[PDB]
Symmetry: C2
Subunit: 205 residues, 2 copies
């Protein structure tokens, strides 16, 4: 239930790095984390041309191809599996957008699937990630902004933390968090938390 499709515990425990991807209706963000829990890259971008009343596959292709052209190679690419269902009609536009994004990411990031048939793109249960970080109110999630801010601006550093930021990147990551803090880019926070949760729940059991 946590991860789909089903990957052998062997390939999961031997991961060297993942790219965790989270998107909304307006923005997308991703984080590259290695098995040392080091944040090798962490980016967000406002894909403002999407979700403007039309569902043009050609525009989705241009946007998603541009997004992934900035991603380094990783063992797995992890997307959110949300709680949206077909029964609610008022959420149809969002659900359709999410499935198109997910479909092209599955297709474009599985660069060798046609030759080896091994899945590299996974969907991770967002509700389970929310419970893991105690971000739930009711059965929905609250913001992980404050929890990410703790990781990024904690003072102690006298015990092994749950996530590491390199020295060359920590200055940029902090300027990125503060410059986008007023806009509250939830996808940026959620991509980091999903990557941490992937290692804590699926790699280092």
């Amino acid at each position: 239930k946590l991860l789909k499709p089903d990957i052998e515990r062997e390939r999961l425990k031997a991961v060297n790095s993942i790219i965790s991807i989270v998107f909304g209706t307006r923005r997308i963000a991703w984080a590259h984390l290695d098995r040392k829990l080091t944040v090798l890259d962490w980016q967000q971008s406002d894909r403002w041309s999407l979700m403007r009343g039309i569902y043009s596959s050609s525009v989705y292709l241009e946007e998603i191809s541009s997004i992934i052209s900035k991603m380094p190679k990783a063992d797995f690419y992890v997307l959110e599996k949300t709680g949206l269902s077909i029964q609610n009609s008022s959420l149809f536009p969002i659900l359709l957008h999410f499935h198109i994004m997910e479909a092209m990411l599955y297709a474009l990031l599985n660069k060798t699937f046609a030759q080896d048939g091994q899945h590299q793109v996974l969907s991770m249960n967002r509700n389970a990630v929310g419970k893991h970080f105690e971000l739930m109110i009711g059965d929905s999630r609250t913001s992980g902004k404050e929890l990410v801010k703790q990781f990024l601006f904690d003072s102690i550093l006298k015990a092994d933390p749950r996530v590491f930021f390199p020295s060359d990147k920590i200055v940029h990551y902090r300027q990125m968090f503060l410059s986008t803090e007023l806009q509250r880019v939830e996808e940026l926070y959620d991509s980091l938390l999903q990557a941490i949760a992937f290692y804590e729940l699926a790699v280092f059991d």
Copy 2:
């Protein structure tokens, strides 16, 4: 309006061959036609695991990769653009299926797009193809079976044919039609009709 995205007229007139793809909820079909209007290939899928209750991107990736592995190369891959609107909540399961199919076909059949940004997958308006073959009664499109039967079994030979079946293949295409005459095989008919309409409306003017 007829074709999306917009393609330079230079590329359209220079087409050597196309793959015309039409899918429903149960089957997919395609036709490979060159600029001499020769049916180089024409076939349909049997049965797939899609549209059986769930929408799994991993399952769509597996099914569509298998379908594409049977297709030859072509200059363009033309998909149907239907009139289903997100405003019509009753059809969202089918609309979701169609958009996932389209998104992965756009992603997987654009093997060079990531380098040059030249679209090779196009969406052709189904209603316009309907009007071109005078199949419309009101705003609904009737079956093209009679047209295709006429194209495959025309023994008068007093008009310039609009499509040509090669000799090593015309035997197989006729027994394909007769074995499928007793079943719902509209995708097979529509894939051929869409290929012809593409040449008559976009290539030769």
